[PDB]
Design a binder for this molecule. Structure first.
Ligand SMILES: [Mg+2]
Ligand SMILES: [Zn+2]
Ligand SMILES: [Zn+2]
Ligand SMILES: [Zn+2]
Length: 471
């Protein structure tokens, strides 16, 4: 298993990829979570420690490593917010019924007189409340600005309040029609720079408050917000044809709620062990590995990588394999539906070939499997938009296992594939080691097979004729 002959072959690499080594790496990832507040979310020290770990492992194995940074504004709500009247009479208002956060607000604990700003009430109003600087013409600094929705963005309103000396901002719904009087999920924008907290209230509350002389509100907004950057970790073999790159990826960040050991520690740790084993391989085609950042924020890291590649470099990538959640405790054996056989949506030419390879491996291991939707749910998405052939594995998340699936893969019908999905309890004990083992083996077989010959993809591309041959 030391020798390069074993790890270079599609049946040898799975035998050399031990589930127990992946679990050791998973335990390392969970230790990183425990040592940095129980999560590995983007722009947290948990993710910084994950990057350091991935990078030093890849270097120790002999890779030149790129830690690719890209700008990222982190906003994680930490707990429920509070709103209380202190003057004239004490009144505690109900969270998610009277008021909610503006997404991308700053944190704060502010008790101040409330001053309404350019209010235009009534059914059918066309309010310009706080949209202009003159609306704050006599606004006493230190106050909480009571502002009505209308015309302009919430960001513009709150930043005007901040430039006026406001301690905090309460935006209530416009109320120009009957169903515009309640709470909504709204945003001050990723570009908000007001520095002060902003919450959202119902219309009837906003009216009452504007009509209360001497009103003072105590306002507690309990979030993390940080304009910063985060990282992708990219490394490729020094061996291999650089014009025919086989690329694998797994996103390395977690949600803020938990350690994210299955989502997506499983893909990351499996891919890392495979990369260490391939350090000593003899591929025909160059293998590139990426651990993506800020994926739980909307595929930001992988999208950044792909969009910021020179065209000359992007045409060199032949296939992308995505491994996101492959240790689900109530697992099924799901393969991306590259040919559209199940859901009618096809990948770029070559994706059906990749799918057939994954199908072949599960068949060889005496295992059933089936398709899963590929409508841009994970980090292959910008690869899809670029016309690059792709595929990947999935063991299931918040969907419920069917009876047919229960008799195919074991586990419990009627229960989620991963009941700890995006939760605090997504830790080391949430991994099904049979699922992890078999999907790591499948990852290995297909990666290695493509590392020896992309012909099945080349053939599909040639039959498509939509991207002629350049060499
Ligand atoms: Mg105005
Ligand atoms: Zn995921
Ligand atoms: Zn996720
Ligand atoms: Zn299919």
């Amino acid at each position: 298993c030391k020798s390069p002959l074993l790890v270079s072959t599609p049946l040898g690499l799975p035998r050399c990829l031990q589930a127990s080594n992946v679990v050791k790496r998973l335990q390392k990832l969970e230790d990183i979570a425990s040592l940095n507040d129980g999560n590995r979310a983007a722009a947290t020290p948990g993710y910084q420690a994950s990057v350091d770990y991935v990078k030093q492992t890849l270097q120790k194995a002999g890779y030149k490593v790129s830690v690719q940074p890209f700008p990222f504004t982190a906003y994680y709500p930490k707990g429920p917010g509070s709103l209380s009247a202190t003057v004239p009479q004490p009144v505690t208002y109900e969270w998610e019924k009277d008021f909610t956060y503006l997404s991308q607000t700053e944190a704060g604990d502010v008790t101040a007189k409330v001053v309404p700003v350019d209010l235009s009430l009534g059914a059918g109003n066309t309010s310009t409340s706080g949209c202009e600087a003159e609306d704050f013409a006599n606004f006493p600094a230190g106050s909480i600005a009571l502002i009505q929705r209308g015309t302009c963005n919430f960001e513009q309103k709150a930043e005007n309040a901040a430039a006026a000396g406001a301690a905090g901002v309460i935006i209530f719904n416009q109320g120009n029609t009957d169903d515009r009087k309640g709470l909504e999920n709204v945003t001050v924008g990723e570009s908000y720079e007001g520095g002060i907290p902003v919450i959202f209230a119902t219309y009837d509350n906003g009216v009452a408050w504007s009509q209360t002389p001497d009103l003072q509100l105590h306002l507690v907004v309990d979030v993390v917000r940080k304009k910063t950057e985060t990282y992708n970790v990219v490394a490729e073999t020094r061996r291999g044809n650089p014009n025919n790159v086989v690329m694998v990826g797994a996103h390395l960040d977690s949600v803020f709620e938990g350690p994210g050991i299955n989502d997506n520690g499983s893909g990351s740790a499996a891919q890392l062990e495979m990369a260490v084993l391939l350090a000593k391989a003899l591929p025909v085609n160059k293998v590139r590995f990426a651990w993506w950042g800020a994926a739980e924020a909307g595929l930001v890291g992988s999208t950044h990588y792909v969009q910021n590649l020179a065209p000359e470099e992007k045409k060199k990538i032949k296939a992308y394999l995505n491994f996101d959640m492959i240790g689900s405790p109530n697992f099924g054996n799901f393969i991306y539906d590259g040919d559209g056989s199940d859901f009618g949506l096809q990948g770029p030419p070559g994706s059906a070939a990749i799918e057939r390879l994954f199908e072949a491996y599960f068949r060889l291991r005496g295992q059933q499997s089936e398709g899963t939707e590929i409508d841009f749910r994970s980090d292959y998405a910008e690869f899809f938009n670029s016309g690059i052939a792709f595929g990947g594995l999935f063991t299931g998340a918040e969907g419920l296992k069917t009876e047919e699936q229960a008799q195919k893969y074991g586990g419990t019908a009627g229960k989620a594939y991963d009941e700890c999905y995006h939760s605090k309890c997504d830790g080391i004990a949430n991994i099904n080691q049979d699922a992890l083992e078999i999907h790591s083996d499948a990852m290995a077989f297909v990666t290695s097979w493509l590392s020896l010959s992309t012909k099945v993809v080349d053939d599909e591309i040639a039959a498509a004729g939509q991207k002629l041959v350049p060499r």
